[PDB]
Structure formats: structure tokens, C-alpha cells
Design an enzyme around this catalytic site. Structure first.
Site, mmCIF file in Angstrom:
data_model
loop_
_atom_site.group_PDB
_atom_site.id
_atom_site.type_symbol
_atom_site.label_atom_id
_atom_site.label_comp_id
_atom_site.label_asym_id
_atom_site.label_seq_id
_atom_site.Cartn_x
_atom_site.Cartn_y
_atom_site.Cartn_z
ATOM 1 N N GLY A 13 0.850 -1.204 0.000
ATOM 2 C CA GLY A 13 0.000 0.000 0.000
ATOM 3 C C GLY A 13 0.878 1.244 0.000
ATOM 4 O O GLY A 13 2.118 1.144 -0.126
ATOM 5 N N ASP A 125 -12.046 -4.311 11.255
ATOM 6 C CA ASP A 125 -12.048 -4.641 9.841
ATOM 7 C C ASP A 125 -11.753 -6.111 9.585
ATOM 8 O O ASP A 125 -10.882 -6.462 8.763
ATOM 9 C CB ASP A 125 -11.070 -3.684 9.129
#
Ligand code: LQ5
Ligand code: LQ5
Length: 284
Positions: A13, A125
């Protein structure tokens, strides 16, 4: 980093990069998460991830082995886990994951989550991509977010979040886990929404639009609308046809609309569904 060989990028990322590597000296197979350090009276933000991993040492939580500072880089060294649950679900879709394995994995996930929750830590998450399996039948919580330091699929998102709740509870993780359970069993995502409203309405269409009886306070939530579509609840037997009574019961308790009525991790572990739980090895 001179001892790490066969280094190959496996994730990336804007904030993190993750590699598989093999220590050529010790033979230990590892995952490495690289973090860039900026100029350093406020704590450097990588400290949060390290602190949490240290605090959350547990058999069903991904294990931080070492931290290596080299040049303007920090490498978090993890014990390597073969693959994520998403990849395992795709590889097992023709035949389905056997029920004894689904049960073992759900049990283990509940144990890791109960541990987090006992430390007042919320995952927030949970999804197949954040759950890692090894060759020996273990499954472990991880958070493979590489966008930013510790401090976007909507499919596992609890309805209270979608409805604008300011305070998340431990129930948000139980909801995500219920969805994962259902997905292991049916071989398809339970609520595969592509936006906030589509996600919410997928939930409403399957479980019925909630009202004040089912969920006291629902009609007062920030993003609730009295003009919402009104669906009646579906036959839960048709929602997860392969699940037996014990399985359906546990799932319905993980998917209770009201976060205050949703079963806890610790109480889920005592459900009769787990009575005959074992530890099967996946075929990988
Ligand atoms: C808001 N929440 C606060 C509490 N948080 C806890 C939290 C915070 C950070 C992390 N970090 C984390 O998994 N790194 C992390 C995860 C995977 C990875 O890549 C790996 C590792 C092993 N094998 C393979 N193939 N590839 C590298 C590195 C893990 C957790 C956990 F597991 F407890 F959920 C989650 C967020
Ligand atoms: C049994 N059946 C149930 C479904 N029925 C149709 C039906 C009935 C009612 C509704 N209502 C609905 O979207 N409201 C509704 C949804 C969102 C909303 O929020 C917004 C909008 C714009 N900006 C911002 N910030 N926030 C306001 C208001 C939507 C449908 C739909 F989409 F399914 F067609 C037919 C009968």
C-alpha cells in the site's frame, strides 16, 4: 537485512510493503513489513502497531518476531503464514470447505477475538483477507492494512456503523465474523454490497428491515430514514441451506441487529455448535 534471502514482494500500500523471505542462517520463513521512517514531541506512529502486536500475543493472532531498523526503514518481521482465508475460500469453492474445518476455523477466530476484546481492543475490519492460515490447521487474526499507520470492502460492516453510530462496540467484530461464517458455508459472500446504501439494503432484504421492536433505538440513529425500504425477514433456512439447527442458531445470534443483543465472543465459544470441535488440517 543480509540474512534474508528469496525475498519476494507479496503485498503493498501507500504506507507499507510486505515480503516473504527466508532467513538463510536460521532457516526461519518470515513475512517482512517494511515501513519508511520520516523525521522524528509526539510518538513515531509505527509504535502503535508494535505495541498492539506485543500486547496481543496469542495462538490465533499473527506473531511479531522482531523489528529491524536499517537506514530510514523499519522492518517488522512476522512468522510466515501460508495464505489468507480469501485465497483458501477461492481454492475450496468447487468442493466447499469441510464442515469440521469451518467449525475449527470459526472456533479459533472466536478465541483470538475474545482475547482482543478482553483487552478492550476492537479489530474493526475483519474480513477473509485479514485472516491467515498455516499448513497445520491454525487460523490467525491479522490486519494487512498497508494504507496508513495504526492509530475498502463494506461486505463485513456491521449495520450500526452503516447507520452512523459514533461509538463502535465489540459487537462490530462479531457481525463481521458471522458474515465470514456464512461465506465459508455457502461459498459466497453473504452481503456483497458496493456502496453504503447497497450494503445496508442487502442486509435489510435478507434479515428484514429493522424496527424499534427488533432494535430499540434504530429509528433514532444518525443515518436512519423513515422512508427506508421495508422488507420482511427471509427464511434463514434458505439463507444458509447447508447449516444444521445448531449452526443456524449460532449464526442468528452473531447477526442480531441490536449490538447489545448480539452474542459475545466468549459466549459464542460455549455454543452447542462447538461441542464436537476438532482441528482438521487443510489440504493445501
Ligand atoms: C483498529 N484495530 C485496533 C487493533 N488492531 C490489532 C492489530 C494491529 C496491527 C496488526 N498488524 C498486522 O497484522 N500486520 C501484518 C499482517 C500481515 C502481514 O503479512 C503476513 C504475515 C504473516 N504471513 C504472511 N503471509 N503475511 C504483515 C504484517 C495486527 C493486529 C491484529 F492481528 F491484532 F488484529 C487492528 C486495528
Ligand atoms: C417490499 N419492497 C421493499 C422495497 N420497495 C422499494 C423501495 C422503497 C423505499 C426506498 N427508500 C429509500 O431508499 N429511502 C432513502 C434512502 C436513502 C436516503 O438517504 C440519503 C439520500 C441522499 N443523500 C443522503 N445524504 N442520504 C433517504 C431515503 C427504496 C426502495 C428501493 F430502492 F428498494 F427501490 C418496494 C417494496
Amino acid at each position: 537485512m543480509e540474512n534474508f534471502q528469496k525475498v519476494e514482494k507479496i503485498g503493498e500500500g501507500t504506507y507499507g510493503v510486505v515480503y516473504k523471505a527466508r532467513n538463510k542462517l536460521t532457516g526461519e520463513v518470515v513475512a517482512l513489513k517494511k515501513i519508511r521512517l520520516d523525521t522524528e514531541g509526539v510518538p513515531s506512529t509505527a509504535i502503535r502497531e508494535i505495541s498492539l502486536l506485543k500486547e496481543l500475543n496469542h495462538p490465533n493472532i499473527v506473531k511479531l518476531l522482531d523489528v529491524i531498523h536499517t537506514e530510514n526503514k523499519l522492518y517488522l518481521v512476522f512468522e510466515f503464514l501460508h495464505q489468507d482465508l480469501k485465497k483458501f475460500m477461492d481454492a475450496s469453492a468447487l468442493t466447499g470447505i469441510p464442515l469440521p474445518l469451518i467449525k475449527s476455523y470459526l472456533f479459533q477466530l472466536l478465541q483470538g477475538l475474545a482475547f482482543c476484546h478482553s483487552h478492550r481492543v476492537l479489530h474493526r475490519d475483519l474480513k477473509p483477507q485479514n485472516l491467515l492460515i498455516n499448513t497445520e490447521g491454525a487460523i490467525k487474526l491479522a490486519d494487512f492494512g498497508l494504507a496508513r499507520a495504526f492509530g475498502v470492502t463494506l461486505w463485513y460492516r456491521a449495520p450500526e456503523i452503516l447507520l452512523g453510530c459514533k461509538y463502535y462496540s465489540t459487537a462490530v467484530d462479531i457481525w463481521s465474523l458471522g458474515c465470514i461464517f456464512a461465506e465459508m458455508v455457502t461459498r459466497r459472500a453473504l452481503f456483497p454490497g458496493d456502496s453504503e446504501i447497497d450494503q445496508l439494503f442487502r442486509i435489510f432484504r435478507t434479515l428484514g428491515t429493522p424496527d424499534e421492536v427488533v432494535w430499540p433505538g434504530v429509528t433514532s440513529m444518525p443515518d436512519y430514514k423513515p422512508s427506508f425500504p421495508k422488507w420482511a425477514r427471509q427464511d434463514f433456512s434458505k439463507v444458509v441451506p447447508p447449516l444444521d439447527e445448531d449452526g443456524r442458531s449460532l449464526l442468528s445470534q452473531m447477526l442480531h441487529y441490536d449490538p447489545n443483543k448480539r452474542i459475545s465472543a466468549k459466549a459464542a465459544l460455549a455454543h452447542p455448535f462447538f461441542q464436537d470441535v476438532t482441528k482438521p488440517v487443510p489440504h493445501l
